[PDB]
Amino acid sequence: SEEDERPIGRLLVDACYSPVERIAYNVEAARVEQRTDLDKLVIEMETNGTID
DNA sequence: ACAACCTCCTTAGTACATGCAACCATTATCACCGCCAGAGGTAAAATAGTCAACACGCACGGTGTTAGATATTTATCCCTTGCGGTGATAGATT
């Protein structure tokens, strides 16, 4: 699919299909107000709009 | 009249900062032994008592029966799963 007829002016790019700009990571205690020997994952993701 | 100066004299004033680990010995040296103190000993009687006797009298614990609880069994019920149909989201615009 890289050996098709591409005119002198048809520019070419990779599979750009997703606009996310950060994904982070932390770990601290859960909210679960009584079941409290247990942790939570945190990931602080960030984009450009298009999806929160 | 003293002044400091030439030389090697000796004296002696100091030697940066933070922290952790380890355990606490060596001496010899007559203390004599005489006296007597209150002061050690203990017999006999105060400050008072033991524990064995024969009584007294009670608590506790183990054997027995009873009680009822619990953990099992059974079976019911609901809350949940996963997929699906199609939801008004996300957010761009009005």
From Swiss-Prot:
Q: Where is this region: Required for interaction with Crp at class II promoters?
A: 2-5
Q: Which top-rank group of organisms is this from?
A: Bacteria
Q: List the disulfide bonds.
A: none
Post-translational modification remark = (Microbial infection) ADP-ribosylated on both alpha subunits by the phage T4 protein ModA. ADP-ribosylated on only one of the alpha subunits by the phage T4 protein Alt.
The UniProt transmembrane annotation reads: none
Subunit details: Homodimer. The RNAP catalytic core consists of 2 alpha, 1 beta, 1 beta' and 1 omega subunit. When a sigma factor is associated with the core the holoenzyme is formed, which can initiate transcription. Both the N- and C-terminus interact with different regions of transcriptional regulator CRP. The rRNA transcription and antitermination complex (rrnTAC) consists of RNAP, NusA, NusB, NusE (rpsJ), NusG, SubB, ribosomal protein S4, DNA and precursor rRNA; S4 is more flexible than other subunits.
Domain remarks: The N-terminal domain is essential for RNAP assembly and basal transcription, whereas the C-terminal domain is involved in interaction with transcriptional regulators (such as CRP) and with upstream promoter elements.
**Cited function:** DNA-dependent RNA polymerase (RNAP) catalyzes the transcription of DNA into RNA using the four ribonucleoside triphosphates as substrates. This subunit plays an important role in subunit assembly since its dimerization is the first step in the sequential assembly of subunits to form the holoenzyme.
Q: Which family does it belong to?
A: Belongs to the RNA polymerase alpha chain family.
- The protein, known as: DNA-directed RNA polymerase subunit alpha
Q: Which gene encodes it?
A: rpoA
Residue window of the full protein shown: 161 to 212 of 329
